[PDB]
Enzyme design. Sequence first.
Site, mmCIF file in Angstrom:
data_model
loop_
_atom_site.group_PDB
_atom_site.id
_atom_site.type_symbol
_atom_site.label_atom_id
_atom_site.label_comp_id
_atom_site.label_asym_id
_atom_site.label_seq_id
_atom_site.Cartn_x
_atom_site.Cartn_y
_atom_site.Cartn_z
ATOM 1 N N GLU A 11 0.795 -1.242 0.000
ATOM 2 C CA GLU A 11 0.000 0.000 0.000
ATOM 3 C C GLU A 11 0.813 1.270 0.000
ATOM 4 O OE1 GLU A 11 -3.738 -1.928 0.337
ATOM 5 O OE2 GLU A 11 -3.104 0.038 -0.310
ATOM 6 N N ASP A 20 -6.542 6.260 -5.022
ATOM 7 C CA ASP A 20 -6.004 4.930 -5.051
ATOM 8 C C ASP A 20 -6.078 4.375 -6.490
ATOM 9 O OD1 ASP A 20 -8.748 2.870 -3.726
ATOM 10 O OD2 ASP A 20 -8.593 4.175 -5.463
#
Length: 164
Positions: A11, A20
Amino acid sequence: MNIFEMLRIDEGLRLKIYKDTEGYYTIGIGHLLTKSPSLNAAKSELDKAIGRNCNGVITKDEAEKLFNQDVDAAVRGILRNAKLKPVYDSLDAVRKCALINMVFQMGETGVAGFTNSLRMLQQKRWDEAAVNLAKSRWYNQTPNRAKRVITTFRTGTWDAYKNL
Ligand SMILES: [Cl-]
Ligand SMILES: [Cl-]
Protein backbone atom coordinates in the site's frame (compact mmCIF):
# COMPACT_ATOMS: atom_id res chain seq x y z
CA MET A 1 8.02 -10.41 7.92
CA ASN A 2 4.62 -9.75 9.51
CA ILE A 3 1.23 -8.42 8.31
CA PHE A 4 2.17 -4.78 9.01
CA GLU A 5 5.35 -4.95 6.92
CA MET A 6 3.56 -6.84 4.22
CA LEU A 7 0.76 -4.32 3.82
CA ARG A 8 3.19 -1.44 4.21
CA ILE A 9 4.93 -2.72 1.11
CA ASP A 10 1.73 -3.30 -0.90
CA GLU A 11 0.00 0.00 0.00
CA GLY A 12 2.94 2.37 0.54
CA LEU A 13 2.58 5.44 2.78
CA ARG A 14 1.33 8.96 1.70
CA LEU A 15 0.67 11.79 4.12
CA LYS A 16 -1.51 13.89 1.73
CA ILE A 17 -4.89 12.82 0.30
CA TYR A 18 -4.38 10.76 -2.85
CA LYS A 19 -6.38 8.67 -5.35
CA ASP A 20 -6.00 4.93 -5.05
CA THR A 21 -5.81 2.54 -8.01
CA GLU A 22 -9.59 2.82 -8.49
CA GLY A 23 -9.54 6.67 -8.27
CA TYR A 24 -10.93 6.79 -4.68
CA TYR A 25 -9.70 9.26 -2.15
CA THR A 26 -7.31 7.70 0.29
CA ILE A 27 -4.53 8.60 2.71
CA GLY A 28 -1.83 7.08 4.87
CA ILE A 29 -1.31 3.40 4.42
CA GLY A 30 -4.13 2.60 2.09
CA HIS A 31 -6.82 4.04 4.36
CA LEU A 32 -9.83 4.63 2.08
CA LEU A 33 -11.58 7.88 2.91
CA THR A 34 -14.55 7.83 0.63
CA LYS A 35 -15.81 6.54 -2.69
CA SER A 36 -17.34 9.89 -3.52
CA PRO A 37 -15.69 12.02 -6.21
CA SER A 38 -15.86 15.17 -4.01
CA LEU A 39 -12.52 16.25 -2.48
CA ASN A 40 -14.39 18.16 0.18
CA ALA A 41 -16.21 15.10 1.27
CA ALA A 42 -12.85 13.44 1.63
CA LYS A 43 -11.38 16.25 3.65
CA SER A 44 -14.45 15.99 5.79
CA GLU A 45 -14.09 12.25 6.30
CA LEU A 46 -10.36 12.82 7.03
CA ASP A 47 -10.93 15.31 9.87
CA LYS A 48 -13.64 13.12 11.35
CA ALA A 49 -11.30 10.08 11.34
CA ILE A 50 -8.37 12.00 12.82
CA GLY A 51 -10.19 14.27 15.13
CA ARG A 52 -8.78 17.61 14.12
CA ASN A 53 -8.71 19.96 11.16
CA CYS A 54 -6.11 18.37 8.89
CA ASN A 55 -6.66 20.30 5.71
CA GLY A 56 -5.84 17.13 3.81
CA VAL A 57 -2.53 16.29 5.46
CA ILE A 58 -1.62 14.12 8.45
CA THR A 59 1.44 13.04 10.33
CA LYS A 60 3.24 9.67 10.21
CA ASP A 61 2.03 8.77 13.64
CA GLU A 62 -1.56 9.61 12.59
CA ALA A 63 -1.09 7.38 9.53
CA GLU A 64 0.21 4.60 11.68
CA LYS A 65 -2.68 4.88 14.08
CA LEU A 66 -5.16 4.52 11.21
CA PHE A 67 -3.19 1.54 10.01
CA ASN A 68 -3.33 -0.19 13.42
CA GLN A 69 -7.07 0.43 13.54
CA ASP A 70 -7.52 -0.89 10.01
CA VAL A 71 -5.59 -4.10 10.51
CA ASP A 72 -7.46 -4.83 13.70
CA ALA A 73 -10.76 -4.20 11.93
CA ALA A 74 -9.88 -6.50 9.09
CA VAL A 75 -8.93 -9.40 11.35
CA ARG A 76 -12.00 -8.94 13.42
CA GLY A 77 -14.09 -8.73 10.24
CA ILE A 78 -12.69 -12.06 9.18
CA LEU A 79 -13.55 -13.62 12.48
CA ARG A 80 -17.12 -12.38 12.42
CA ASN A 81 -17.56 -13.65 8.85
CA ALA A 82 -19.08 -17.11 8.54
CA LYS A 83 -17.49 -17.76 5.17
CA LEU A 84 -14.10 -16.37 6.17
CA LYS A 85 -13.53 -17.61 9.67
CA PRO A 86 -13.27 -21.29 8.92
CA VAL A 87 -10.69 -20.65 6.21
CA TYR A 88 -8.68 -18.34 8.31
CA ASP A 89 -8.67 -20.85 11.20
CA SER A 90 -7.47 -23.61 8.88
CA LEU A 91 -4.39 -21.73 7.71
CA ASP A 92 -0.80 -21.51 8.92
CA ALA A 93 0.57 -18.16 10.07
CA VAL A 94 2.02 -16.99 6.77
CA ARG A 95 -1.00 -17.87 4.79
CA LYS A 96 -3.30 -16.12 7.25
CA CYS A 97 -1.49 -12.96 6.25
CA ALA A 98 -2.35 -13.39 2.61
CA LEU A 99 -6.03 -13.58 3.54
CA ILE A 100 -5.85 -10.51 5.74
CA ASN A 101 -4.16 -8.69 2.84
CA MET A 102 -7.07 -9.43 0.51
CA VAL A 103 -9.59 -8.40 3.10
CA PHE A 104 -7.82 -5.14 3.70
CA GLN A 105 -7.79 -4.30 -0.04
CA MET A 106 -11.27 -5.46 -1.03
CA GLY A 107 -13.34 -5.80 2.10
CA GLU A 108 -14.92 -8.82 3.81
CA THR A 109 -17.69 -8.81 1.33
CA GLY A 110 -15.43 -8.90 -1.71
CA VAL A 111 -13.38 -11.74 -0.40
CA ALA A 112 -16.26 -13.84 0.86
CA GLY A 113 -17.23 -13.94 -2.88
CA PHE A 114 -14.17 -15.99 -3.93
CA THR A 115 -16.16 -19.04 -2.95
CA ASN A 116 -14.35 -21.60 -5.07
CA SER A 117 -10.93 -20.30 -4.14
CA LEU A 118 -11.81 -20.27 -0.46
CA ARG A 119 -12.84 -23.91 -0.53
CA MET A 120 -9.61 -24.84 -2.30
CA LEU A 121 -7.57 -23.02 0.26
CA GLN A 122 -9.51 -24.77 3.02
CA GLN A 123 -8.64 -28.10 1.46
CA LYS A 124 -5.03 -27.06 1.16
CA ARG A 125 -5.01 -27.44 -2.68
CA TRP A 126 -2.43 -24.66 -3.12
CA ASP A 127 -1.65 -24.84 -6.76
CA GLU A 128 -5.31 -25.13 -7.63
CA ALA A 129 -6.32 -22.25 -5.47
CA ALA A 130 -3.62 -20.04 -7.02
CA VAL A 131 -4.95 -20.66 -10.52
CA ASN A 132 -8.49 -20.00 -9.41
CA LEU A 133 -7.56 -16.82 -7.61
CA ALA A 134 -5.96 -15.51 -10.79
CA LYS A 135 -9.23 -15.74 -12.74
CA SER A 136 -10.43 -12.47 -11.26
CA ARG A 137 -10.78 -8.81 -11.91
CA TRP A 138 -8.53 -8.29 -8.86
CA TYR A 139 -5.57 -9.99 -10.57
CA ASN A 140 -6.33 -8.29 -13.87
CA GLN A 141 -6.51 -4.85 -12.31
CA THR A 142 -3.61 -5.11 -9.80
CA PRO A 143 -1.55 -7.99 -11.09
CA ASN A 144 1.72 -7.27 -9.31
CA ARG A 145 0.13 -7.13 -5.91
CA ALA A 146 -2.21 -10.08 -6.73
CA LYS A 147 0.86 -12.14 -7.80
CA ARG A 148 2.61 -11.45 -4.52
CA VAL A 149 -0.43 -12.47 -2.46
CA ILE A 150 -1.15 -15.48 -4.62
CA THR A 151 2.45 -16.70 -4.35
CA THR A 152 2.14 -16.35 -0.62
CA PHE A 153 -0.91 -18.64 -0.49
CA ARG A 154 0.84 -21.02 -2.87
CA THR A 155 4.10 -21.47 -0.98
CA GLY A 156 3.37 -20.54 2.60
CA THR A 157 6.62 -18.48 2.60
CA TRP A 158 7.51 -14.76 2.33
CA ASP A 159 9.54 -15.22 -0.84
CA ALA A 160 7.40 -12.79 -2.88
CA TYR A 161 8.09 -10.00 -0.42
CA LYS A 162 11.78 -10.82 -0.06
CA ASN A 163 14.15 -8.45 -1.84
CA LEU A 164 11.78 -5.55 -1.81
CL1 LIG B 1 -10.87 -13.77 -15.33
CL1 LIG C 1 -0.29 -4.15 -8.82
